[PDB]
Amino acid sequence: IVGGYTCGANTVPYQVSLNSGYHFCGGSLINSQWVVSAAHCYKSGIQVRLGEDNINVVEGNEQFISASKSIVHPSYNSNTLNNDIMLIKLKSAASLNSRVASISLPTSCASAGTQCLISGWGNTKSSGTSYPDVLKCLKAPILSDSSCKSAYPGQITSNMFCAGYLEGGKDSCQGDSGGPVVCSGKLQGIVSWGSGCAQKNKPGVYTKVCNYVSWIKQTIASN
Ligand SMILES: NCCc1c[nH]c2ccccc12
Ligand SMILES: [Ca+2]
């Protein structure tokens, strides 16, 4: 997260870190046994880390739980990043508490102008590299479909939205991939892609979770 703020320990209790020997992606806990992330975060040997603030220090609220199964969206296209969503089942259920909590799926798609909270442990710089150890937050609005399409001609599908600032300076970035965009206490987006980070006229692009609720619910019901 470029241009964000330190969230504060366990203020974003649905935020997960996906760990393969190191943090590589974010995710959201949607019930005690399931995580949603980006399909571009897929790899084998995932440990889900819940209750994290500092990802390099054991602080006391963590739960570390191996993935048993990963399900990439059947229509994920790695070239276009259309359908950039995946589900991860935990080997055992998480213990839910005030610091580890699931985030609701949306009943409705959020409109342009809605203010959302984006969070992650990604890069905090738009050029060069500085990775924070503690969770970073950004408040950002959903942009109009027309702004988003103007910024990324020919690249925006009905399964994507833009959020952030056309002036630049504030965005998700490398390592934030798969993390949540939460609006009005519902998961609306997943950190998916962009042209660099925090560039002028190049806002972040997010997976539009409201299009995937039936797939998520039917997949969880049968796995
Ligand atoms: N808005 C940030 C999108 C993002 C995801 N993964 C990245 C890797 C490099 C640069 C940007 C990104
Ligand atoms: Ca920790």
What is the Rg, in whole angstroms, of the alpha carbon atoms belonging to the chain? Answer: 16
CA–CA separation, 132 vs 121, rounded Å? 6
φ/ψ bin of 5: left (φ > 0), alpha (ψ from -120 to 50), beta (otherwise): beta
Per-domain boundaries in the chain: 5-7+103-211, 15-102+212-221
Which residues 6+ apart lie within 8 Å of 58 measured at CB?
A: none
What is the CATH architecture assignment of 5-7+103-211?
Beta Barrel (2.40)
Among 118, 104, 109, 98, smallest CA distance to 50 is for 98
Cβ-count burial 89-102 (b if 16+ within 10 Å, e if not): bbeeebebeebbbb
CA–CA separation, 137 vs 20, rounded Å? 23
In the block, tokens 């996906």 appear at 18
Ligand 1 centroid from CA 204, angstroms: 8
How far apart, in Å, do the first and last CA atoms of the chain sit? 33
Q: Which ligand is nearest to the CA of 62?
A: 2
The resolution of the experimental structure, rounded to one decimal in Å, is 1.5
In the block, tokens 């500092």 appear at 54
> What is the signed CA dihedral for 35, 217, 86, 212, rounded to 10 degrees?
-130
CA–CA separation, 69 vs 136, rounded Å? 28
Q: Which residues are catalytic?
A: 40, 84, 177
User: Which residue has the CA at smallest separation from atom 9 of ligand 1?
Assistant: 174
**SS in 3 state form for the chain?**
CECCEECCCCCCCCEEEEECCCEEEEEEEEECCEEEECHHHCCCCCEEEECCCCCCCCCCCCEEEEEEEEEECCCCECCCCECCCEEEEECCCCCCCCCCCCCECCCCCCCCCCEEEEEECCCCCCCCCCCCCCCEEEEEEECCHHHHHHHCCCCCCCCEEEECCCCCCCECCCCCCCCEEEECCEEEEEEEECCCCCECCECEEEEEHHHCHHHHHHHHHCC
Burial of 157 (0-12, 13-18, 19+ CB in 10 A): middle
Q: Is 26 in the pocket of ligand 1 (CB under 6 A)?
A: no
Which residues 6+ apart lie within 8 Å of 112 measured at CB?
A: 141, 142, 143, 144, 145, 147
Q: What separation in angstroms does the CA of 193 have from each of 12, 79, 95?
A: 22, 11, 31
Q: Are 195 and 134 in contact (CB under 8 A)?
A: no
Q: Is 173 in the pocket of ligand 1 (CB under 6 A)?
A: yes
CA–CA separation, 84 vs 214, rounded Å? 16
Whether 175 has a binding-site annotation, put simply, is: yes
Tell me the CATH number for domain 15-102+212-221: 2.40.10.10
Q: Same CATH topology for 5-7+103-211 and 15-102+212-221?
A: yes
Residue 164 CA: nearest ligand 1 atom is 1
Tokens read off for 27: 């995710």
Tokens read off for 50: 């819940």
Give the number of C-alpha atoms closer than 13 A to the C-alpha of residue 69, restricted to the C-beta side. 10
Phi, psi at residue 170, to the nearest 5°?
Answer: -140, 120
